[PDB]
Amino acid sequence: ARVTVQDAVEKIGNRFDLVLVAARRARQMQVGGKDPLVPEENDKTTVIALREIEEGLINNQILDVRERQEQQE
Amino acid sequence: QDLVVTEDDCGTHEGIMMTPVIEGGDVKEPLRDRVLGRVTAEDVLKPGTADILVPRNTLLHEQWCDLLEENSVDAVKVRSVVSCDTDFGVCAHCYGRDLARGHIINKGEAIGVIAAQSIGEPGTQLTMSSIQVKNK
Amino acid sequence: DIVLNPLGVPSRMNIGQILETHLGMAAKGIGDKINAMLKQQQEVAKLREF
Amino acid sequence: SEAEAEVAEIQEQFQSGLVTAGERYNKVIDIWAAANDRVSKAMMDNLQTETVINRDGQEEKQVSFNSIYMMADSGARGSAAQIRQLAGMRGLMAKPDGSI
Amino acid sequence: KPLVGTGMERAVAVDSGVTAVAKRGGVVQYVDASRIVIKVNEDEMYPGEAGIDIYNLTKYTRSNQNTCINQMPCVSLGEPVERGDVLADGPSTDLGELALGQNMRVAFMPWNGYNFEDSILVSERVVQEDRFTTIHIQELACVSRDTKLGPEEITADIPNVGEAALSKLDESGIVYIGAEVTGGDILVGKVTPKVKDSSLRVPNGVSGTVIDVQVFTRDGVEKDKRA
Amino acid sequence: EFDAIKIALASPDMIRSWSFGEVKKPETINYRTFKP
Amino acid sequence: GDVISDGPEAPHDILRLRGVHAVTRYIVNEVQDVYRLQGVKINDKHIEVIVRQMLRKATIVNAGSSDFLEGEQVEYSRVKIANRELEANGKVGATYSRDLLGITKASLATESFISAASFQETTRVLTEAAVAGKRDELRGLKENVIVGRLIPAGTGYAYHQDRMRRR
Amino acid sequence: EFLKPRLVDIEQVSSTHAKVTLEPLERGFGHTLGNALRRILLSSMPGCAVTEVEIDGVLHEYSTKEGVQEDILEILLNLKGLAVRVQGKDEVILTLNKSGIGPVTAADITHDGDVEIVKPQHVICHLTDENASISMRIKVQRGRGYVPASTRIHSEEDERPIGRLLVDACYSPVERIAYNVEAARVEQRTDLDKLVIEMETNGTIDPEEAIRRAATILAEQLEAFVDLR
Amino acid sequence: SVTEFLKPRLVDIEQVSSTHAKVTLEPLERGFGHTLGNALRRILLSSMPGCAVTEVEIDGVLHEYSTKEGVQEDILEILLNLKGLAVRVQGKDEVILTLNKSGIGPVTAADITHDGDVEIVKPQHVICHLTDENASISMRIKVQRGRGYVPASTRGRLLVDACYSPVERIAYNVEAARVEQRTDLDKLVIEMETNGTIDPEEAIRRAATILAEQLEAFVD
Amino acid sequence: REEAVVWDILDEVIREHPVLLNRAPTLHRLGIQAFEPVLIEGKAIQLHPLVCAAYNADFDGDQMAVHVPLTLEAQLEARALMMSTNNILSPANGEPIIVPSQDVVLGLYYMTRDCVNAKGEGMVLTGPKEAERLYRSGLASLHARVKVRIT
Amino acid sequence: EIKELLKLGDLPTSGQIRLYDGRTGEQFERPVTVGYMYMLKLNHLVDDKMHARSTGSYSLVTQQPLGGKAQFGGQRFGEMEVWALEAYGAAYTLQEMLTVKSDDVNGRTKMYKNIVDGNHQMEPGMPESFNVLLKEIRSLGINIELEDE
RNA sequence: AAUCGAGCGUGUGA
Ligand SMILES: [Mg+2]
Ligand SMILES: [Zn+2]
């Protein structure tokens, strides 16, 4: 469900929201310097982002809450 | 090029009643095919006007039209894009389902370009006393 | 030497491609038989007759 | 040969002045189309049948294993008309105009 | 030659003018890969001439479409030639027969979908035997002109270059016949002032060997020792 | 930084406002030098 | 809506008399007959989309109290906007008659001179656009591909919506 | 439990055609071994072939030699198909010198004790002028497979422009391999068969040595599976 | 040059399950992958040792087709079920076994008494299911040692096709392999599944050493 | 100069970097589709046999343009929308586009045919694996009418 | 006559011969047609036709990289290709292939800087072909311009 | 920075 998203659709909701979250996550991993926990088995960064999305622990509302918390400090 | 699915549901009630094209004895397409993926503007009724088969707000899928065939439905009225009460675009339900995804059409899909391509492409495949009943 | 699809023959209707192939096989067979006779240093009369 | 015999007979009638130019033309096209259909019928059936000696020693006719038949009936590549052209007869052909 | 042909290959081969044909019947007096000299017979002599027919053959001359025009003699010493007989076959000719391609052993069968949709599967033996190897000749021109600052000079003085590129050069900057040159290698040396290199170079992605060098010089020009 | 396209006719004053100088000579460049 | 003399039938009189759905069914059925005679399967939805694009105009028969003049050909969307305004005012809307324009004519008769010019007859479209002092809002697909901005479709639709909502 | 195959007949009908019989083999092992040996033979039989040529007075192969019937390209093509057997060395330099009217064949190369010409009747070229003298140096290397001249390059990538007449090397000494599995009239069992390998080569390789080399290659390849870690 | 060869750098096995493993080696020589794959496949498919069911006796059969009541499944289905039983014989070449279990309910494979020389691979292989109070079955099964596969078309009462080879599922695929410069090499991947008599990779190893022993007449 | 570093970097770049293949004329939407490229030693593009129907492409000399999406958003919309795996149905009528033809259809047709007196007729098998063994070992033919336990 | 010529050469008159797979050795179930055909090498070589560019040459009137194989040119991503990208809804791909892959003076440089710095950036840009259009409409006698907002 | 460019005709493939 990485190249073609079926399972993560029921894990991220709207696929336009999926595109937006993927773009934001790519720009963050490129500039924010967040240290991931998934070992790198010669995999693309977008692939790891899709894996973390299909995990279902990060969504748009939680990202907005974290953005507000970060802008507070 | 400028036509884009811009809204979700206009709630219109006008539409087109459709019968299968018959030239002689044969039937060109079943009711199922021409209603497949469409959106009804009313409640489809079982013959005998007693029961409501399907509600008007549901997306007519393969299962629903199979049930209609089971009930032997005669004619359906569906929300077409011609009778869509939307300004500057077409809502999702007047255009029926996306023939390439299987779900409902999302807002912002240029169906006009899709329509133009889907009509033009087959163009390369294009060229250049009494009536009798034969059925019981 | 070359592997060809037999599926392109019926739709494209170029059947001379098959008769020419059979005739090429026959011609190369006669050539190989002449080659066999020449490797044997056979008499000129044998080659004349064949 | 039967098609040739019938067109010769209709030509004899025309020499006797029974039919007209257009009617004879249409009738001959019709009978040649009928000969084409008969040739296709006697071709496709002879191309889909086999005589297979069964375990009992008797013959159980089955679908033929011919390669061009496999191509046609399988729908892998080729149609019935193409097989008619390469194995039966090409059939009626068109003039530079619409006329056959 | 085509193993299966139509019999018209002779007419195409002899009527295209690419094969050296025998004008007068005679006897071969000398055959080389580039020349054929024929001692004309006395039956077809005309008074007042020696009776020698000489046929020089085109050798690796570029055609309009960057192919190779090459004539190979098809006769040997002492062979009696007659009027109209082929002496040397041109390109795509074999003993006076039009030879467009090669006879190949083919099998009509699908092979793991490697001949899908008219695709072709080729044995390694075809590549090994060089059955369909071809020679392609291209022509590259270097023209010396007069600039607004001054005349342009043909020389080997190209600055800011490595020693390897200067090893293949000579006193004038033109590399010898038969040298192996690849894309980016200088053929004819020339520099423009400002100095900048205005020399001719092999097009990038093309690597061949020089077979011909022609020089055209207008009157009043000092030709160098390479020239 | 723009939302639409406006098309209309141009005033002779508008055309003069576009230009930076008036073109007089019909020759493009001299051939003795490369100077326009 | 009933034929008086038999023969081949025009689509424009069908629209003006038999109605809108009648002409849409006529067009869809005939186009699909042409496609099916060659054994080609396309949905009716695309033909309906094009037919709708062929019916974006309306002729003002009697404007009454509306701001429309008499005899003009105006976008049907503007007519609906005016009818909504009159309904908010409680007043009756101006009557209108639909017209069946050709595909080329409907493309040329758009409210955007950029698209009409880039399609055909650039000189004309430009002449009328300059005479009328026309203004082209960036809202169609061509008007955004030519200026190099994101199209109002697909992944660019959200950007256009944000542009509309911010201004 | 298995009857191991063994060489029971190596029939040399000609210098380039040999029948080798392996017996006995159980059912199924015949075809397996036949296919494995045929593929290893056709794929990895080493040999010697002409690699570089340097004819005096010649700059490139796209030219003509004086008083020679054939082109230099044709001469290099004829030298490509020269069957040479080399013993003890992997790099030899033969010299061929000739003059006068006649077909310059494979019997005219200067004789050396470490080099053998399988077919002396192989016609390299022809001479048509009495004063025409031809002299060439031929470099023969021992290799495996087919190394085209375009891929292989000189060690320092800089070699004599006048020479370096590079010929494509077809190192494979074998040209055709068939194998048959046939019933053997064994008086002990009835399920035994024999594997007849019919080989046609260029005459430069001993069939028994070739088959033993193929078996060695197969065993060395299977050793990785047997010795698994 | 003609003697030395490249050494396999990447030898990897992925353990999908106990009897399902993906084994592959990088890299192989061109044409070597198909040669090794075909040889290994053939020797695994017809030259592997094992034991299976060959003969069974059902009393009262003297005509062409007869029927026996009280059994839920047909005799053909019962013998087909018995065909797939995984049997190990370590001591002898031929042992006759008997099944002894009655009563209405489930029927497993662990109710047959343990033998010193015969060990059962899986104890959950159902044979049948008894359903009647007066129905009880106890037949004799002949187990023979052999290699490969033998149909019973020609040559106690009933004859059962024997699956001597412990190979359940063998397939090989050759992919394009790549190194720093060479990209025309072969990579052989083997998909092996067994019935439990022998480990999947162990059967391949056994057949590899069987084939390497067949060519001992040419060891230098 | 084609160093080992170059090869490693090309391997890094090619993987999971969609490439839009496009054959002209682009008659419909599917005339341009994204693919995951794999490095080929040769100098021609390898095309999947199933997508030949979408491109109207046959291998009788057709050329095909290759375009590289560059930014992250175009790569994402190539992965999500343009990929040939995510485009299986035809927008014209909803029908599938990847329906096999030619070699695949002939192969499947051959391997499902029936012969009345084929080798292995009448045998009862324990499953598909036994049929595989009986075919590969050459004991039972491919057209033999048998009885098999199917799950 | 072809059958007789096959007979004289001791070949099967059907023209089909038992053929064996080179990978396994197994005989093919049905006889395979094998013979000799005259193959032609065409003047269409991938050595020629294969071509691919990245940051090459540009024309002068427009900044679109023109040309072809001989001139190191790009691929004509024409009108129908833009239609196809439109029907997919791939807006960013159109933005790339109209503003980034051509027609860009300043946005095609810092994008290259970003790429060599491992970034994907600077998609928006104003096509200079549209500026040429505006200048050739203004110089024609018509006032066409942009708005402040 | 060295770096460079168009139209017309013609014949070809898709
Ligand atoms: Mg075509
Ligand atoms: Zn609506």
UniProtKB/Swiss-Prot annotation, chain A:
Organism expressing this protein natively: Escherichia coli (strain K12)
UniProt KW Transcription keyword: yes
Catalytically driven reaction(s): RNA(n) + a ribonucleoside 5'-triphosphate = RNA(n+1) + diphosphate
Shown stretch of the complete protein: 2 to 74 of 91
Organism lineage: Bacteria, Pseudomonadati, Pseudomonadota, Gammaproteobacteria, Enterobacterales
The protein's assembly and partners: The RNAP catalytic core consists of 2 alpha, 1 beta, 1 beta' and 1 omega subunit. When a sigma factor is associated with the core the holoenzyme is formed, which can initiate transcription. The rRNA transcription and antitermination complex (rrnTAC) consists of RNAP, NusA, NusB, NusE (rpsJ), NusG, SubB, ribosomal protein S4, DNA and precursor rRNA; S4 is more flexible than other subunits.
Name of this chain's protein: DNA-directed RNA polymerase subunit omega
One annotated GO molecular function: bacterial-type RNA polymerase core enzyme binding
Enzyme Commission code(s) on record: 2.7.7.6
Similarity-based family: Belongs to the RNA polymerase subunit omega family.
Any GO CC annotation of this UniProt entry: cytosol
Curated annotation (Swiss-Prot), chain E:
Lineage top rank: taxon: Bacteria
Subunit structure: The RNAP catalytic core consists of 2 alpha, 1 beta, 1 beta' and 1 omega subunit. When a sigma factor is associated with the core the holoenzyme is formed, which can initiate transcription.
Family per record: Belongs to the RNA polymerase beta chain family.
Function: DNA-dependent RNA polymerase catalyzes the transcription of DNA into RNA using the four ribonucleoside triphosphates as substrates.
Name listed for the protein in its UniProt record: DNA-directed RNA polymerase subunit beta
Lineage, top ranks: Bacteria, Pseudomonadati, Pseudomonadota, Gammaproteobacteria, Enterobacterales
Gene: rpoB
UniProtKB/Swiss-Prot annotation, chain G:
Superkingdom per UniProt: Bacteria
Purpose: DNA-dependent RNA polymerase catalyzes the transcription of DNA into RNA using the four ribonucleoside triphosphates as substrates.
Assembly and oligomerization: The RNAP catalytic core consists of 2 alpha, 1 beta, 1 beta' and 1 omega subunit. When a sigma factor is associated with the core the holoenzyme is formed, which can initiate transcription.
Protein family per UniProt: Belongs to the RNA polymerase beta' chain family.
Protein name: DNA-directed RNA polymerase subunit beta'
Primary gene name: rpoC
Residues of the full protein shown: 1207 to 1373 of 1407
Swiss-Prot record, chain K:
Lineage: superkingdom: Bacteria
Signal peptide (residue range): none
N6-acetyllysine: modified positions: 7
Function text: DNA-dependent RNA polymerase catalyzes the transcription of DNA into RNA using the four ribonucleoside triphosphates as substrates.
Quaternary state and interactors: The RNAP catalytic core consists of 2 alpha, 1 beta, 1 beta' and 1 omega subunit. When a sigma factor is associated with the core the holoenzyme is formed, which can initiate transcription.
Similarity remark: Belongs to the RNA polymerase beta chain family.
Name assigned to this protein: DNA-directed RNA polymerase subunit beta
Residues of the full protein shown: 1194 to 1342 of 1342
